[PDB]
Amino acid sequence: KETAAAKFERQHMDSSTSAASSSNYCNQMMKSRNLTKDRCKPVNTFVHESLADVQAVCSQKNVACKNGQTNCYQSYSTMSITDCRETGSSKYPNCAYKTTQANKHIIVACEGNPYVPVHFDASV
């Protein structure tokens, strides 16, 4: 089975594009990255940075996760990210998403040995 670290990568990393400029980026990526089985996953963010630069966030600014737990880390810099949010007319199995692009700080939850991202907690 897919580890938590691997799931974070599949769901949240997109190092090979620098940004989403296409209105169809999320429609394609949510399907490609296996986020549309059974139900459309409603909301998901992709990060357009190298895996090593995202992994490096686990030793950046320690902050609380949005549930108040202490294993979250905010990137010092903004990073290029894309939010994918299921539209108000989307109907599974034809999952439809609004793509929005921005530079924002990311907040990841890290766990394990090695201590790596396992959840995309928030953006700032």
User: Which residue range forms the structural domain that includes residue 80?
Assistant: 2-124
Catalytic residue among 33, 75, 119, 120: 119
Q: How far apart are CA 24 and CA 108, in angstroms?
A: 26
Technique used by the depositors: X-ray
Catalytic residue among 8, 9, 11, 12: 12
CATH code of the domain covering residue 35:
3.10.130.10
Output Rg (C-alpha) for the chain, integer angstroms: 14
7 annotated as a binding-site residue: yes
66 annotated as a binding-site residue: yes
Bond preceding residue 117 cis, omega within 30 of 0? no
C-alpha closest to that of 31 among 94, 91, 100: 94
Resolution for this PDB entry, in angstroms: 0.9
* Number of domain units in the chain: 1
Tokens of 4: 């938590």
C-alpha closest to that of 45 among 88, 98, 82: 82
3 annotated as a binding-site residue: no
12 has catalytic annotation: yes
Q: Are 14 and 47 in contact (CB under 8 A)?
A: yes
Q: Give CA angle at 24 (78, 31), nearest 5°.
A: 95
31 annotated as a binding-site residue: no
Tokens of 71: 């294993």
Quick one: CA dihedral 68, 3, 116, 49, positive or negative?
A: negative
Number of Cβ within 10 Å of residue 22's Cβ equals 13
